[PDB]
Amino acid sequence: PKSACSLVKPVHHLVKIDKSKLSPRFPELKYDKSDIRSPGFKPKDTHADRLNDHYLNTLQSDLLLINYSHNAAVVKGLKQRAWSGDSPYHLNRPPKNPRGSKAQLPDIHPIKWSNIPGLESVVINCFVREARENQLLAITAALQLQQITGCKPHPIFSKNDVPTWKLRKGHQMGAKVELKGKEMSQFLSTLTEIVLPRIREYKGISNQSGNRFGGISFGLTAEDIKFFPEIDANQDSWPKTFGMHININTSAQLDYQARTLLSGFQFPFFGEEK
Amino acid sequence: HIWSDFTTRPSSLSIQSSKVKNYLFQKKASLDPPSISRRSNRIKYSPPEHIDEIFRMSYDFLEQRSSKFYELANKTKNPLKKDALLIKAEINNPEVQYNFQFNNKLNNVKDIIDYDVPVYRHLGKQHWESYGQMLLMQRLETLAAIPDTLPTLVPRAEVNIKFPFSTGVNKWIEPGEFLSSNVTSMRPIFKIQEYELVNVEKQLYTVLIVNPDVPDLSNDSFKTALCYGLVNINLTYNDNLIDPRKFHSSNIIADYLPPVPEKNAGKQRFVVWVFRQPLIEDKQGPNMLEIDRKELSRDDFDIRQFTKKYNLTAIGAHIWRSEWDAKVAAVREKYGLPPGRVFSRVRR
Amino acid sequence: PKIKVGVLLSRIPIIKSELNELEKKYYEYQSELEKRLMWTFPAYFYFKKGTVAEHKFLSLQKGPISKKNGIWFPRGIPDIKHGRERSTKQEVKLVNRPVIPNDRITEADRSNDMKSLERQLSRTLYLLVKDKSGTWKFPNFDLSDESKPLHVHAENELKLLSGDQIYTWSVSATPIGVLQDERNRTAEFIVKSHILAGKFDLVASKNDAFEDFAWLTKGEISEYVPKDYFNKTEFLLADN
Amino acid sequence: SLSPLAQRVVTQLSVMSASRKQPKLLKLAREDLIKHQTIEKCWSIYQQQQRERRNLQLELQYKSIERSMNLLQELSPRLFEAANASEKGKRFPMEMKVPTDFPPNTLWHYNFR
Amino acid sequence: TRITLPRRPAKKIQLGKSRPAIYHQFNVKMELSDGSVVIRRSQYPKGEIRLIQDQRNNPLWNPSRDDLVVVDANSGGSLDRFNKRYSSLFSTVELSEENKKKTQ
RNA sequence: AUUGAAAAAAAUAAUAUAUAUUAUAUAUAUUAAUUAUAAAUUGAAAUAUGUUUAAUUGAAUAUAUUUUAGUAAUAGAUAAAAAUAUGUACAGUAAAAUUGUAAGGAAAACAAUAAUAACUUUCUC
């Protein structure tokens, strides 16, 4: 190679060129995944969704009313500070970090008819630490996820080398899955309706849980996983079962709004709130 | 049921094949798809279950929406709004979609795809923008046809070119393609398809083919030559194939001279530009313009000055490429041109 | 102007909403597409070798047609893997008394009882009351103490009215709407709330503003209530 | 040579895998493709109208909230402050359950506490 | 020391030929403690199931109800035998006899 | 072509046949496959003459031939776990820190963390 010097030549027109349409290659990837001609086609709306219908029919209006605040205004977040131009050395100086944080934080807008909180995704994390010695437990965990949820699990691979825990790097330690729409609706419905009621001593979810910008996380143990219908039906095929974390990601601007939304979906809360 | 009506709606908004019409609008799944010609394959085929009644209901829904759009269109006055509402009314028609998707869009048949109809015009615009326009712009930019000849281009018409008289074979030239001297010896024919609202009864077009690569030894550089030029040409949405049938000698400001590159003179680019003339109001009849033929250079051309002086706006373009071969001498002799020059192999 | 506190009590749907014919047909069509593009059932994992369950499942199932040389198959040579013909959908048939679902239509439905809290298990009901005149309207209350908030006043008034037979939860302290007047120079503030358990059962017999009650949905409210009142209060009511 | 645990997990990952379980590609005639296109366009338009109707209802409700708040602010500041008091810790009643697709034996409960 | 099953050469799934994963599921009916039934998608070949302990009979999810009976699995373990074994004592007499101890 | 059934069609592309051009083009025809590849007495299917059986039919037995089961990860132009360190074409953006989450703790794995004025298509008052 004569040189390593990236440089994009400017154009003389405003027409946007996508070369995937000019290449005769990959004819079947030109169709959208929603197009019946695409091999990636998968029917989406096969049946009505009770949880979504309930949220659209009842909870949107109630949440709007509850979160209404008169003459509210946007609360801007911690952003990068700017150097005052009292010294020449400030001319090309990069901006300063936010006051309390090394990362910028989002602004909080008043709740209005267009931005009511709602569920956007659910992610299940299953990290079998005992899979460090046995790689097959990862496959078992993936099957547990597939049976509980119905979606394709994705493997989790070790990234750090910690000797005290005897954790190497590049090995399969478990599985994950992300849920949206009817599938997450079903997963949450079955959780609340079957599994959580069958836990020994269950008070709810901690009121001091969740990332500070919307999203609530809580865990389940192996005995708790045994309550799901699929496992109970064929106990024989489940000598061992694994726990997992559950992360519910919503549109809530702050965590307490998400807590109210989940309580609407019947998720109990026990601790004292921040 | 406005889509079943054809008192005022053009007849092209319907599938001209009775078999396919009946199958698409069938009541029970008793017929078979006309697309599958072989009976064997027809028996093998099995349509998705519960598809005709859902189709009937979706048809009814879309047809009610189209009826509302027609209601508002019959009352709108501005031609742009009228055309937009017509497009929105007929865009979702299964018959229109069938016709456009599965019939020719270049050599269109008036009774299937009529470009006098806003919906067909809009669907054609979308189809062109999907693939054809992007390729044209890529070829122009990469081969440096834009800055060399004209500052920019905002494509608004599809231009296709062909060389039917030279050899006898039929082929639309891909932009940027290399053509033999024999292929490009005789004359090109154009096809300028317009997709916007333009007054067919007043608008006139010009076409200039230029070569911005003819060497010039006075300053050790290149220069531009006007290969071909036509002015005062009128088109129609469905009859827009320019050929010696559709123009006179008064339209010709520079008769066609062929691509005749010189040996080791490099790969020459022949670029086609289509402009539309000014459209004066308060006057009846097309506004024809007279070209100053004693000022036209024809060998030291300046296209930017030409278009600026005659107030022309480009709407379409095309391009091909040429290089020396054995038939160049024969073409020179046939056209009465002097013997070609021969340049060195090295650029020093 | 004099302040007044109105309340609308809502009963939420108890069962999933009904589907319009378009929704039903779309869902069945998509379900058949899914079945057509559906994977083979891995019975080799859900039924172990040589077990009675496996035997009975196999007996229930009907096998496909295998390809055999010397025969003509007009629909195409069979292509089977794991017991399914890949060119078509695959149909699998399957204190222990069978599940008998409950009817979605109730005795209140058939008897057209306008007061029972079962007249529509899938719709949303709203409490309406009749004044001295012939104008149905949402319950309203007067107040002069002003030592209590609007929603608390509404809840206590409803409790006293029903005579300790209604359980009501206030969605929020914020009023949801206002109705102004000029003749009587009154401003009436509405508050939203839901019914959780109990029965309304108008009690007071000394001729309060309330005469007769009903639990109507949006359409019946449109049919009962005055047109202007409906235009002024319609958006506060849920479609389903 | 494999262990019975190996066979069990291979069966589990067989249930994972798509090998020897998917049917043939769905190839539709041109007419049925057009039918399907019309179905999807109808459904998309319908869902957009439903979403916009809900959005309009919420817009109107929010307008009502703000009008009522202005009126109450100018009429009685005490009640306005009581209303504007935050509900940060609010939770929904635990029997406001999501609707199911067939009703229960006891439709409604007429006694409490 | 770790045990793993070997990786076979992965079959190449070309660009555009990659199909989605639609596992086989059944429209199974699920009965709660009350008479309510929910339709759901399950991969187990069991079209019908009923639950003995679930949301509809849990105090935390059912605060308003006055009376709420609880139950566990039957025909398993020695449950309820601590009552079946003693028939002489039966249900308020014991409550009265548990009045006080009179110890200090 | 046969095979449940009374003029023929008018697109991109692919395949078969053929011939125009010192032009990888045109005409007619059709619309296949797209997760597969040896080796299985033993699991499961479909195919005949007795059969019991009611014109059938049927369900069950016996054999000949064939089919399925070798059950194996990526289903995404995958994107900062480990594996191909040289070419080309297409495409994307890391890292720390903070807040949470079963075992989980300083340290394992997942999720969240800057702003939408302007421009389009669609829906809607």
From Swiss-Prot, chain A:
Component of the mitochondrial large ribosomal subunit (mt-LSU). Mature yeast 74S mitochondrial ribosomes consist of a small (37S) and a large (54S) subunit. The 37S small subunit contains a 15S ribosomal RNA (15S mt-rRNA) and 34 different proteins. The 54S large subunit contains a 21S rRNA (21S mt-rRNA) and 46 different proteins. Unlike bacterial L5, uL5m does not bind zinc. Keywords: Mitochondrion, Ribonucleoprotein, Ribosomal protein, Transit peptide. Component of the mitochondrial ribosome (mitoribosome), a dedicated translation machinery responsible for the synthesis of mitochondrial genome-encoded proteins, including at least some of the essential transmembrane subunits of the mitochondrial respiratory chain. The mitoribosomes are attached to the mitochondrial inner membrane and translation products are cotranslationally integrated into the membrane. This is Large ribosomal subunit protein uL5m. Coiled coil: none annotated. It holds the Pfam family Ribosomal_L5_C. SUPFAM superfamilies: RL5-like.
Curated annotation (Swiss-Prot), chain B:
GO terms for biological process: mitochondrial cytochrome c oxidase assembly; mitochondrial translation. CDD domains: PEBP_euk (cd00866). It comes from the Eukaryota. The keyword Ribosomal protein applies. Its main location: mitochondrion. Keywords: Mitochondrion, Ribonucleoprotein, Ribosomal protein, Transit peptide. The keyword Chaperone does not apply. One of its GO terms (cellular component) is mitochondrial large ribosomal subunit. GO terms for molecular function: structural constituent of ribosome. It is found in: Mitochondrion. Component of the mitochondrial ribosome (mitoribosome), a dedicated translation machinery responsible for the synthesis of mitochondrial genome-encoded proteins, including at least some of the essential transmembrane subunits of the mitochondrial respiratory chain. The mitoribosomes are attached to the mitochondrial inner membrane and translation products are cotranslationally integrated into the membrane. Component of the mitochondrial large ribosomal subunit (mt-LSU). Mature yeast 74S mitochondrial ribosomes consist of a small (37S) and a large (54S) subunit. The 37S small subunit contains a 15S ribosomal RNA (15S mt-rRNA) and 34 different proteins. The 54S large subunit contains a 21S rRNA (21S mt-rRNA) and 46 different proteins. Belongs to the phosphatidylethanolamine-binding protein family. Mitochondrion-specific ribosomal protein mL38 subfamily. Present with 7700 molecules/cell in log phase SD medium. This is Large ribosomal subunit protein mL38.
UniProtKB/Swiss-Prot annotation, chain C:
GO terms for molecular function: structural constituent of ribosome. It is found in: Mitochondrion. Keywords: Mitochondrion, Ribonucleoprotein, Ribosomal protein, Transit peptide. CDD domains: NUDIX_MRP_L46. Its main location: mitochondrion. Residues 84-94 have a biased composition (Basic and acidic residues). It comes from the Eukaryota. GO terms for cellular component: mitochondrial inner membrane; mitochondrial large ribosomal subunit; mitochondrion. One of its GO terms (biological process) is mitochondrial translation. Transmembrane segments: none annotated. Disulfide bonds: none annotated. Pfam families: MRP-L46 (PF11788). Component of the mitochondrial large ribosomal subunit (mt-LSU). Mature yeast 74S mitochondrial ribosomes consist of a small (37S) and a large (54S) subunit. The 37S small subunit contains a 15S ribosomal RNA (15S mt-rRNA) and 34 different proteins. The 54S large subunit contains a 21S rRNA (21S mt-rRNA) and 46 different proteins. Component of the mitochondrial ribosome (mitoribosome), a dedicated translation machinery responsible for the synthesis of mitochondrial genome-encoded proteins, including at least some of the essential transmembrane subunits of the mitochondrial respiratory chain. The mitoribosomes are attached to the mitochondrial inner membrane and translation products are cotranslationally integrated into the membrane. Present with 7400 molecules/cell in log phase SD medium. This is Large ribosomal subunit protein mL46. It comes from Saccharomyces cerevisiae (strain ATCC 204508 / S288c).
UniProtKB/Swiss-Prot annotation, chain D:
The gene is MRPL28. It comes from the Eukaryota. This is Large ribosomal subunit protein mL40. Component of the mitochondrial ribosome (mitoribosome), a dedicated translation machinery responsible for the synthesis of mitochondrial genome-encoded proteins, including at least some of the essential transmembrane subunits of the mitochondrial respiratory chain. The mitoribosomes are attached to the mitochondrial inner membrane and translation products are cotranslationally integrated into the membrane. One of its GO terms (cellular component) is mitochondrion. Its main location: mitochondrion. Keywords: Mitochondrion, Ribonucleoprotein, Ribosomal protein, Transit peptide. The chain holds residues 34 to 146 of 147 of the full protein. GO terms for biological process: mitochondrial translation. One of its GO terms (molecular function) is structural constituent of ribosome. It is found in: Mitochondrion. Present with 6300 molecules/cell in log phase SD medium.
